[PDB]
C-alpha cells in the first residue's frame, strides 16, 4: 500500500499527463510514480524532474539507468533499452511532468485532509513541531516534515538524505499514511524547500512564516524570493478564512508576503512589542529549565509554552499559539503543545532534568546564527558562557577566524576542537581558529609546558583540545552552578566524520554521563576549574 | 657543481703539491670554497677555515679578488659565525659592483639577504 492510482494508463491520462509522444500504455505495475530517479523503483514510470541541479534530460537518463519503465524528457529518450517494460513516454514539459508525477488520488487525499507549511528563516522547526503537537491534541493525527527527517504524515519520520525529499515521493508517502494510520497529511518545508518546489506542489491549508528575512539570497539571487514563492504557493490553493498569516510584524518580508495572495484569508500578527498584535508576555519567569509566560491576547491562549531561549523560543511559542487557538479557542487544548515545546527537542535544547550545571546543545554553523545564539545565551546566561565548537574540513576558510572572533568577543572561556575533520589534517584548522585571536599553536604549546596559561587581553580565556569527547566532557565538568554550558558544534546531528571513516559518538547521553560522573570526580579531589586539571600527586 | 665536496679537493691537491706550472691561482681557491660552502650534508666549516689559512700563507704569490670576499661571507653567515663575516664585508665594499656578486640573482638562499637579517638579530646595528 505504498500509493494508489498510479498503476494504470488511464490514471495518468486523467492526471493531465500529456507527453505528446507515448508507446503503448502504462501497463507496468507501479504503486506510486516518482519524478526523482532515486525515489522511483524498477519497473515503475518516472516522470521528468524539474530542477536547477538536475534537468529533465538528466532525470530521464538517471531513471532509464535505474530501471524505470517510463522516462520523460524534451528529446527522445531510450528508456526501453534498460528497463523492465518497453512502454515509455517522453514529456517535453519538465514542470508538467513533475506535477503529474504525483497521482490524482494521492494528491487529493493530502490536500483534502489538512496541510500546514512553515517556512521561516530562524526557528521554523521549533514552531512546526509545536503546531503538529497542537493538531494532535486537537484530535487529528498529522505529521510535520523537517530538514533532518521527511515526515509527510504520522508520528514516525522516514530517513531522507536531502532536507526536502522528492515531491512525488512525499505525496506518495502522504497518501499511504492517509490511507491507513494517519488522519491528516501536512507537508511542511523550509524556505529553500518551498523555493525548490517541494511544498509548492501541494495545496496548503495554512501557510504561515515563523521568521521572514533574507533567505536563499545566494541561491535564488534575489531577496524575498522564498517569501514570494511561499505567497504564490499559498495563493494557488487558498480558501476563505482558512489560511493563516501569523508572522512577526517587525519583519517587512512577512508583511510583503501577507499583502500578496487572496485578501479573504485570515491575517494576524504574533509580535510581542506591537500593540496591534495584542500579544505580550506580561510575565517574568525566564529560566534555563522552563520559561512560562502569561499571554494576554483576545485570540491567543492564556498560558504559553516553556521555551529554552529568551526571544527565539518565545517567538516560536507565540507563533504556535495562534495555530493552536485557530483550531480550538479553549486554552486547555494547548497544554499538550506547551508540554511538547518544553520537551527540549534537538534544536536549541534546554538543560537536563538532572540537578547539575545547565547544558544547552545548539546547532550553530553559520557566523550569523552562531552570533545570535551567543547573544541569546549571554542574555540568558547568569554567570558564565562556556562554549565548545569546531570547524569542518574543506569548508569556508574565512569562516573560521570570524567565528572564533565572535565566540571569544562575548564568552569568558571557550574550547576549540575539531568538529568535522573529514580527511583534513587536524591541528591545522585549529591553528586557523587560533589565528583569529592572534595566537599561534606554537605560542600555546610552549606555554603549556609551564603552568601559567596567560589569558586574553580582554580578560577572557581560551582553551583547545584535539579530541572532541574529552574536551566536551571537560567543558561539561568545567561549569558553575548558575552557569550553563553551550555546545554549538552540533545539534540534532549524530555523525562525526574523522577522516575517511565516520563515528556516531556525538549525543546528549555523553553529556548526561559526564554530569553524573562529575560528582565522583569532585569526590575524588580532581580540580576542574580550568583546562590544566590539578591532579593530586 | 657536483655536490660532493671532496672530488674538488683531490684536484686541488694535485696542484698544491706539484710543479710550478701547475700551481694554484686565485681562481682555483675560489672554486674549492664554493664546493664546501654550497654543500648539503655535513659541517664543512672547519674545512673552509683551513683552506683560507693556506691562501694567506701564500700571500706573496696570491691575493684576493671579489668573489673571494663574496664566497667567504656566505659561509660564515650561513653558519652563524657573524663576527668574521663582518670583517670580510669591509673588503667587498671597497670593490665596486660587489653587492651584485653577493646576491647571485638570489639563486642560493639570497646570501645578501641573509647577512642583513642576521646582523639585526644580533643587535649589530651600527654594522647594519
Amino acid at each position: 500500500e505504498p500509493k494508489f492510482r498510479m498503476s494504470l494508463a488511464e490514471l495518468l491520462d486523467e492526471s493531465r499527463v500529456v507527453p505528446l509522444s507515448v508507446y503503448g500504455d502504462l501497463e507496468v505495475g507501479i504503486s506510486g510514480v516518482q519524478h526523482d530517479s532515486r525515489l522511483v523503483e524498477s519497473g515503475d514510470l518516472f516522470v521528468c524532474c524539474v530542477g536547477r541541479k538536475t534537468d529533465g534530460h538528466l532525470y530521464l537518463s538517471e531513471a532509464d539507468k535505474r530501471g524505470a519503465v517510463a522516462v520523460v524528457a524534451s528529446k527522445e529518450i531510450d528508456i526501453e533499452e534498460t528497463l523492465g517494460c518497453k512502454a515509455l513516454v517522453i514529456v517535453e514539459d519538465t514542470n508538467a511532468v513533475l506535477a503529474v508525477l504525483a497521482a490524482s488520488f494521492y494528491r487529493h487525499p493530502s490536500k483534502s485532509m489538512t496541510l500546514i507549511g512553515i517556512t521561516g528563516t530562524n526557528g521554523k522547526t521549533t514552531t512546526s513541531y509545536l503546531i503538529k503537537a497542537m493538531y494532535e491534541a486537537m484530535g487529528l493525527r498529522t505529521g510535520m516534515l523537517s530538514t533532518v527527517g521527511y515526515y509527510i504524515y504520522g508520528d514516525n519520520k522516514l530517513e531522507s538524505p536531502h532536507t526536502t525529499p522528492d515531491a512525488v515521493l512525499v505525496q506518495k508517502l502522504m497518501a499511504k499514511m492517509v490511507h491507513n494510520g494517519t488522519e491528516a497529511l501536512v507537508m511542511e518545508a523550509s524556505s529553500h524547500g518551498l523555493a525548490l518546489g517541494r511544498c509548492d506542489k501541494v495545496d496548503f491549508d495554512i501557510a504561515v512564516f515563523t521568521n521572514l528575512t533574507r533567505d536563499h539570497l545566494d541561491f535564488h539571487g534575489t531577496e524575498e524570493e522564498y517569501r514570494d514563492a511561499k505567497a504564490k504557493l499559498f495563493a494557488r490553493m487558498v480558501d476563505p478564512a482558512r489560511h493563516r498569516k501569523i508572522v512577526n510584524i517587525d519583519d517587512p518580508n512577512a508583511a510583503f508576503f501577507l499583502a500578496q495572495g487572496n485578501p479573504d484569508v485570515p491575517i494576524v500578527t504574533f509580535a510581542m512589542e506591537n500593540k496591534s498584535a495584542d500579544v505580550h508576555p506580561l510575565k517574568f519567569q525566564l529560566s534555563l529549565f522552563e520559561t512560562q509566560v502569561l499571554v494576554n491576547t483576545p485570540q491567543g491562549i492564556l498560558e504559553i509554552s516553556s521555551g529554552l531561549l529568551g526571544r527565539h523560543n518565545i517567538y516560536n511559542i507565540l507563533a504556535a499559539v495562534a495555530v493552536g487557538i485557530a483550531v480550538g479557542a479553549p486554552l486547555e487544548d494547548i497544554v499538550k503543545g506547551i508540554e511538547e515545546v518544553d520537551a527540549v527537542p534537538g534544536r536549541c535544547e534546554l538543560i537536563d532534568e538532572e540537578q547539575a550545571f545547565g547544558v544547552i546543545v545548539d546547532y550553530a554553523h553559520t557566523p550569523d546564527a552562531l552570533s545570535r545564539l551567543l547573544d541569546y545565551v549571554r542574555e540568558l546566561g547568569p554567570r558564565r558562557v562556556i562554549t565548545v565548537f569546531g570547524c569542518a574540513g574543506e569548508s569556508d576558510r574565512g569562516k573560521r577566524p570570524i567565528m572564533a572572533k565572535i565566540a571569544t568577543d562575548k564568552s569568558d572561556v571557550t574550547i576549540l576542537t575539531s568538529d568535522n575533520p573529514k580527511t583534513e589534517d587536524p591541528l591545522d584548522i585549529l591553528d586557523d581558529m587560533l589565528a583569529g585571536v592572534g595566537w599561534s599553536m606554537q605560542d600555546y604549546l610552549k606555554h603549556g609546558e609551564n603552568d601559567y596559561y596567560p589569558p586574553l587581553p580582554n580578560g577572557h580565556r581560551l582553551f583547545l583540545h584535539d579530541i572532541r569527547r574529552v574536551a566536551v566532557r571537560c567543558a561539561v565538568a568545567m561549569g558553575e552552578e548558575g552557569d550553563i554550558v553551550v555546545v554549538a558544534g552540533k545539534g540534532h546531528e549524530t555523525y562525526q566524520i574523522e577522516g575517511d571513516k565516520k563515528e556516531f559518538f556525538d549525543d546528549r547521553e555523553e553529556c548526561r554521563e559526564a554530569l553524573q560522573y562529575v560528582d565522583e570526580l569532585h569526590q575524588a579531589g580532581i580540580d576542574t576549574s580550568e583546562f590544566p586539571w590539578r591532579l593530586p600527586e | 657543481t657536483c655536490g660532493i665536496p671532496e672530488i674538488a679537493f683531490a684536484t686541488f691537491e694535485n696542484m698544491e703539491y706539484g710543479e710550478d706550472h701547475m700551481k694554484p691561482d686565485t681562481e682555483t681557491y675560489n672554486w674549492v670554497i664554493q664546493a664546501y660552502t654550497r654543500a648539503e650534508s655535513y659541517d664543512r666549516v672547519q674545512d673552509v677555515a683551513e683552506l683560507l689559512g693556506m691562501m694567506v700563507e701564500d700571500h706573496k704569490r696570491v691575493q684576493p679578488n671579489v668573489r673571494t670576499y663574496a664566497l667567504l661571507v656566505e659561509c660564515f653567515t650561513k653558519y652563524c659565525v657573524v663576527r668574521e663575516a663582518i670583517r670580510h664585508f669591509r673588503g667587498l665594499k671597497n670593490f665596486e659592483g660587489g653587492t651584485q656578486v653577493l646576491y647571485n640573482d638570489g639563486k642560493y638562499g639570497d646570501p645578501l639577504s641573509l647577512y642583513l637579517r642576521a646582523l639585526c638579530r644580533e643587535g649589530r646595528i651600527v654594522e647594519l
Binding site: 559518538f505 555523553e510 580532581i526 590539578r534 600527586e537 | 655535513y42
Partner: protein, 294 residues
C-alpha cells in the same frame, strides 16, 4: 620438524620466507629446471617456491614483529649514554622506567592535555584511575592516557620522537654559559661537579647538531621490527652427535619469539586482564632481545 627433517612453515628455517633448500625442488617435491624463466612460475600456486637457487638461504633475510617497543643496549649502556645525552634527564630516571614498573606522567609536550600534574615517572597509580575511566568514554581515557600516562619504552620512543633539536641547542648553550659562574674558586669536591655538568653539556650539543644534518632519525634507537640472520649462517644442523650443531643463535631467537607471541595473544585474549598481566611479560620480552644483542 619433529623427526621429519623438513622445515616447518613460519619457522626459523622456512623455505618460503628464506628460499628453497634444494635447487629447483619446491615445497611440493616436483622439479622445474632453473636457468629457464621462460615458463616457470617464480612462485608456484601451491607454494612460494622461488625456484632459482639454494644460495639465497645464505643471503635472504627475515623480520619479526614485536608487540612492544624495546630498547637497544649500546646507547643506554655507555656511561655517556647517547639517549641520556639527548634526554637531559637523570640517567636513573630514564633507566628505572625501562627496567622496572614506574610510570611517566607527561609523555608528550607536542599536544595539549586536560589532566595537568605534569609529573615524571611515579610509582603510585593509586590516584583514582577507575572512576576516571568510568567518567571518561570508552577510549576517551585511552586518548588521555596516551597523552599523559606513560610506560615501558613506548614512552621513550615517543619522547624522543617529538623533541626540538634547534631548541635543545639554545637551552644548552645558555645553561653552559651560566655555569662556570664562580668557577675555579671553591672546594675540590665542588669544582669537580661543576665540570662534569659542564661537559655533559658540550657532549649533548654535539649529538644534536649531528642529528640535524645527518639524515638519521633519533627515534630509531627504540626498535619496532626486529631483524633475523639468514638461515644458513646459523646452520643449526641436526646435532647428530656433534651436540653443538644447533646454534645458540637459534636458542636465543626462540625465546624472544615466544614471549612476544604470549603477549600478542594476551592482549587479544584478555583486554579485561589488567596491565599487571601485560606488565609482567613486557619486561620478559625486553630481556630476551637484550641478551641476543649484547
Amino acid at each position: 620438524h619433529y623427526k621429519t627433517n623438513k622445515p616447518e612453515k613460519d619457522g626459523l628455517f622456512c623455505e618460503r620466507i628464506f628460499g628453497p633448500i634444494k635447487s629447483g625442488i619446491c615445497a611440493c617435491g616436483n622439479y622445474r629446471v632453473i636457468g629457464d624463466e621462460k615458463e616457470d612460475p617464480k612462485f608456484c600456486e601451491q607454494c612460494g617456491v622461488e625456484f632459482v637457487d639454494s644460495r639465497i638461504r645464505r643471503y635472504q633475510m627475515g623480520y619479526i614483529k614485536l608487540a612492544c617497543p624495546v630498547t637497544h643496549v649500546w646507547y643506554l649502556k655507555r656511561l655517556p649514554s647517547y639517549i641520556a645525552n639527548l634526554l637531559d634527564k637523570p640517567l636513573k630516571e630514564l633507566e628505572g622506567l625501562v627496567y622496572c614498573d614506574f610510570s611517566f606522567a607527561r609523555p608528550i609536550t607536542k599536544k595539549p592535555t586536560f589532566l595537568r600534574l605534569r609529573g615524571l615517572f611515579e610509582y603510585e597509580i593509586q590516584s583514582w584511575k577507575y572512576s576516571i575511566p568510568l567518567f571518561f568514554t570508552t577510549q576517551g581515557f585511552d586518548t588521555f592516557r596516551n597523552r599523559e600516562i606513560s610506560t615501558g619504552a613506548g614512552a621513550i620512543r615517543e619522547q624522543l620522537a617529538d623533541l626540538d633539536l634547534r631548541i635543545i641547542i639554545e637551552n644548552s648553550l645558555v645553561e653552559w654559559e651560566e655555569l662556570g659562574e664562580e668557577g675555579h674558586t671553591g672546594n675540590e669536591w665542588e669544582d669537580r661537579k661543576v665540570g662534569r655538568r659542564k661537559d655533559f653539556l658540550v657532549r649533548r650539543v654535539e649529538l644534536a647538531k649531528h642529528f640535524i644534518r645527518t639524515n638519521i632519525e633519533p627515534e630509531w634507537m627504540v626498535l619496532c621490527l626486529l631483524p633475523v640472520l639468514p638461515p644458513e649462517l646459523r646452520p643449526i644442523i641436526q646435532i647428530d652427535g656433534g651436540k653443538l650443531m644447533s646454534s645458540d643463535i637459534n636458542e636465543l631467537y626462540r625465546r624472544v619469539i615466544y614471549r612476544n607471541n604470549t603477549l600478542t595473544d594476551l592482549l587479544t585474549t584478555s583486554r579485561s586482564t589488567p596491565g599487571e598481566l601485560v606488565m609482567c611479560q613486557e619486561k620478559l620480552v625486553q630481556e630476551a632481545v637484550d641478551t641476543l644483542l649484547d
